[PDB]
Design a protein around this motif. Structure first.
Motif, PDB file in Angstrom:
ATOM      1  N   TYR A 150      -9.317  57.031  38.442  1.00  0.00           N
ATOM      2  CA  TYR A 150      -9.678  57.609  39.730  1.00  0.00           C
ATOM      3  C   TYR A 150      -9.918  56.585  40.825  1.00  0.00           C
ATOM      4  O   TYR A 150     -10.371  55.469  40.576  1.00  0.00           O
ATOM      5  CB  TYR A 150     -10.919  58.488  39.558  1.00  0.00           C
ATOM      6  CG  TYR A 150     -10.756  59.490  38.445  1.00  0.00           C
ATOM      7  CD1 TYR A 150      -9.987  60.638  38.620  1.00  0.00           C
ATOM      8  CD2 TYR A 150     -11.309  59.256  37.194  1.00  0.00           C
ATOM      9  CE1 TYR A 150      -9.773  61.528  37.567  1.00  0.00           C
ATOM     10  CE2 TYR A 150     -11.098  60.135  36.137  1.00  0.00           C
ATOM     11  CZ  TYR A 150     -10.331  61.266  36.327  1.00  0.00           C
ATOM     12  OH  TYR A 150     -10.122  62.127  35.269  1.00  0.00           O
ATOM     13  N   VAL A 151      -9.607  56.982  42.047  1.00  0.00           N
ATOM     14  CA  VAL A 151      -9.788  56.108  43.192  1.00  0.00           C
ATOM     15  C   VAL A 151     -10.706  56.746  44.222  1.00  0.00           C
ATOM     16  O   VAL A 151     -10.635  57.947  44.483  1.00  0.00           O
ATOM     17  CB  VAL A 151      -8.442  55.796  43.868  1.00  0.00           C
ATOM     18  CG1 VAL A 151      -8.668  54.958  45.116  1.00  0.00           C
ATOM     19  CG2 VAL A 151      -7.535  55.072  42.891  1.00  0.00           C
ATOM     20  N   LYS A 162      -5.573  58.392  40.423  1.00  0.00           N
ATOM     21  CA  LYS A 162      -4.805  57.198  40.755  1.00  0.00           C
ATOM     22  C   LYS A 162      -3.325  57.570  40.676  1.00  0.00           C
ATOM     23  O   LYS A 162      -2.910  58.284  39.761  1.00  0.00           O
ATOM     24  CB  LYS A 162      -5.125  56.071  39.763  1.00  0.00           C
ATOM     25  CG  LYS A 162      -4.367  54.764  40.003  1.00  0.00           C
ATOM     26  CD  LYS A 162      -4.723  54.134  41.349  1.00  0.00           C
ATOM     27  CE  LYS A 162      -3.844  52.918  41.666  1.00  0.00           C
ATOM     28  NZ  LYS A 162      -4.000  51.793  40.693  1.00  0.00           N
TER      29      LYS A 162
END
Length: 672
Positions: free
Chosen positions: A411-412, A434
């Motif tokens: 995840y970003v 991501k």
């Protein structure tokens, strides 16, 4: 889609000569037979519509499968053992585990087994200086009263009979002799009062003989008193207050026989609290002459406010102080995220702690001789994680990864800043799986609040995580009105400047499109309470801006909110239709209920609210939903989901919203 029939009445209201029709006034009574029947019918329609969604049950199952998970807290030393809290992920209350160098961890105290239903809960927990005795307070059901139990750590058996009639109390030991606690009634027997008193319980004696420390004579009467003994057992700090705003503070030097109480602050003009002491020097956190607070020192022998000297000066951000391992840690909120600075007790800045990124922190609390410290970190893309921090080197290592079925690297969470209408810059935190492509086609949910000095800080949510796992984007905007930048930021979003809040939110939406994150037919706005107001106003001013609107428990009738139950407390931020003709025109100008217009095509909407609620009455949601159904002229459904009578229900609600949001964006199959 066949909306139930909603009766229109003839109620007309008058504000400074202006007349305003309120055809759904009867829906303000959420307990009338007619309204409950309306609720019943609306839910049937809403559910029937959601049952038409193919992947609803899949989203639900996915959520329920990831909703619960084990948790673990940082370990703390007490005597010859390390203690730490754990949670099955299902257990209602956290369990206290114990571990000794040689053997393996063992259960020490399980609050769940103290109540057949699991109500009896653990509140305060304080070990004696040697760690051989444990004093802890337990609360039954939703009661404010407490009992303080004494347990022999080695045998795990009750040391003495528990102390009764304890309330709003801490537990602070003086070596291994006993501890200070607060209570409203004499250990003997008498008739109630609101005179909170500090008492000292010496171990090996009956509670009825506890000595009065503070609060009995007229000069010491206060509604709330607290007592804390410093880690080195040298000073006794007593706080006295009548409300949550301001407190007096006194100090007694226990290294001296029969030392009298000296006054650290004798008025209630400001908040002041003890951080720690080093020798005869007191370290105090206070907002006296400093709204964002400062850390000061003063000798215990002459502690009055005129003698306080800044150790950590007031800054532009609100200060929070933690101490541990012989260090002081200044915590701040910058652009809604955490920053921690390390200082020695002489005020020398050691280093800026390098946190695992932008998010929310907890911890940095320890004893003087703790070899290391622990802190928790989290944000929209990362579940709560435990980190170990080496005081001397500043080295940070992972201690306990989250048990939540979500791998952080997948995840970003990027920070961005955009410009409002007047040109103001506003923070925006976007999170997603991501590998996202900025093609402007990602199903996006934009969230916001904007008001009541409430600051939106990042925090992990299973529901949001599941949203990301569906290819969705989650964007949180720190609109004006919140508390992310002090008072000026708050006021810029109150009374006749409330429109600033909406503009900021509007600007946020356009930014997400321009930057190619999403597009109109892939955008959804969300918010609750004052946040529901946000959604309601934006959707009425710019129904072309989004594809979906999700207003939860919102304040929607801005002309009558103040007359309802609990509505009084929001007058400072909103103002009222009765304040003045000017305020009325402003309120009427954006009030969601009154800005829904016949013929307009509104976005797909799902109004959510409980059937009964004291904080935000359903009346707002009921009348708003009824108006949308009657006025909307487009193909988009205007639904309201009313919760009646729990994790099960929460899971169900999230599923319905996500299923609905995706289904309304055209998806006939989960994204991908």
């Amino acid at each position: 889609l066949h909306y139930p029939v909603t009766r229109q009445g003839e109620q007309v209201d008058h504000y400074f000569g202006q007349a305003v029709a309120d055809p759904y006034r009867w829906l303000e009574d959420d307990r009338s037979p007619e309204t409950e029947a309306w609720v019943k019918a609306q839910n049937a329609v809403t559910q029937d519509y959601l049952a038409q969604i193919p992947y609803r049950a899949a989203i639900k199952e996915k959520l329920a499968a990831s909703w619960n998970y084990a948790k673990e807290g940082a370990p703390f030393r007490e005597g010859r053992y390390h203690y730490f809290f754990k949670n099955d992920g299902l257990q209602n209350q956290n369990v206290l585990w114990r571990q000794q160098e040689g053997k393996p961890a063992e259960v020490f105290l399980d609050p769940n087994t103290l109540s057949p239903d699991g109500t009896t809960a653990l509140d305060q927990l304080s070990f004696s200086r040697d760690g051989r005795i444990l004093a802890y307070s337990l609360s039954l059901a939703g009661s404010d009263w407490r009992e303080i139990h004494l347990m022999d750590v080695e045998s795990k058996q009750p040391l003495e009979t528990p102390l009764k009639d304890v309330k709003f109390s801490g537990i602070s030991w003086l070596g291994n002799e006993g501890f200070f606690y607060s209570s409203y009634d004499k250990p003997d027997g008498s008739a109630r009062t609101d005179q909170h008193k500090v008492y000292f319980h010496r171990l090996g004696t009956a509670q009825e003989d506890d000595r009065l420390v503070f609060g009995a004579i007229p000069a010491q009467h206060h509604r709330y008193v607290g007592a804390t003994v410093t880690e080195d057992d040298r000073f006794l700090l007593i706080s006295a207050a009548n409300s949550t705003s301001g407190n007096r503070l006194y100090v007694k030097d226990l290294s001296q026989e029969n030392a009298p109480l000296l006054t650290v602050q004798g008025d209630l003009d400001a908040d002041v609290s003890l951080v720690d002491n080093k020798g005869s020097t007191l370290y105090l956190l206070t907002n006296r002459d400093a709204p964002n607070r400062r850390l000061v020192t003063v000798d215990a022998a002459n502690p009055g406010p005129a003698h306080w000297r800044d150790l950590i000066p007031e800054r532009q951000q609100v200060l929070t102080v933690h101490s541990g391992s012989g260090y002081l840690f200044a915590e701040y909120m910058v652009d809604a995220t955490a920053r921690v600075e390390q200082f020695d007790y002489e005020g020398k800045r050691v280093r800026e702690v390098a946190l695992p990124g932008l998010g929310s922190v907890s911890g940095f609390n320890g004893k003087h001789d703790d070899p290391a410290l622990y802190f928790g970190f989290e944000n929209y893309a990362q579940p709560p994680t435990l980190y170990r921090f080496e005081p001397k080197s500043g080295a940070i290592s992972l201690y306990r990864a989250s048990a939540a079925p979500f791998k952080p690297e997948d995840y970003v969470s990027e920070q961005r800043f955009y410009q409002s209408k007047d040109g103001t810059r506003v923070p925006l935190i976007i999170s997603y799986r991501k590998g996202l492509k900025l093609d402007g086609s990602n199903p996006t949910i934009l969230y916001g609040y904007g008001g009541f000095d409430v600051s939106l800080t990042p925090s992990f949510s299973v529901s949001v995580a599941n949203w990301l796992d569906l290819g969705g984007v989650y964007a949180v905007a720190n609109l004006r009105g919140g508390g992310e930048y002090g008072q000026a930021w708050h006021l810029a979003g109150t009374q006749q400047n409330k429109q600033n809040v909406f503009d900021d939110f509007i600007a946020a939406a356009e930014y997400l499109k321009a930057e190619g994150y999403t597009r109109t037919d892939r955008l959804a706005i969300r918010g609750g309470s004052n946040g529901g107001l946000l959604v309601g106003a934006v959707m009425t001013q710019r129904p072309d801006l989004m594809r979906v609107a999700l207003p939860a428990v919102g304040v929607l009738d801005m002309l009558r909110y103040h007359t309802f139950t609990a509505g009084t407390g929001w007058a400072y931020d909103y103002g009222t239709s009765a304040d003045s003709e000017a305020m009325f025109d402003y309120l009427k100008g954006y009030s969601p209920l009154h800005n829904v217009r016949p013929g307009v095509s509104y976005p797909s909407t799902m109004v959510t609210t409980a059937d009964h609620n004291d904080r935000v009455v359903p009346a707002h949601s009921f009348k708003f939903a009824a108006t949308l159904q009657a006025d909307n002229a487009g193909p988009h459904p205007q639904l309201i989901r009313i919760e009646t009578n729990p994790v099960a229900k929460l899971i169900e609600q999230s599923a319905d919203i996500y299923a609905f949001t995706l289904y309304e964006m055209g998806y006939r199959e989960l994204p991908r």
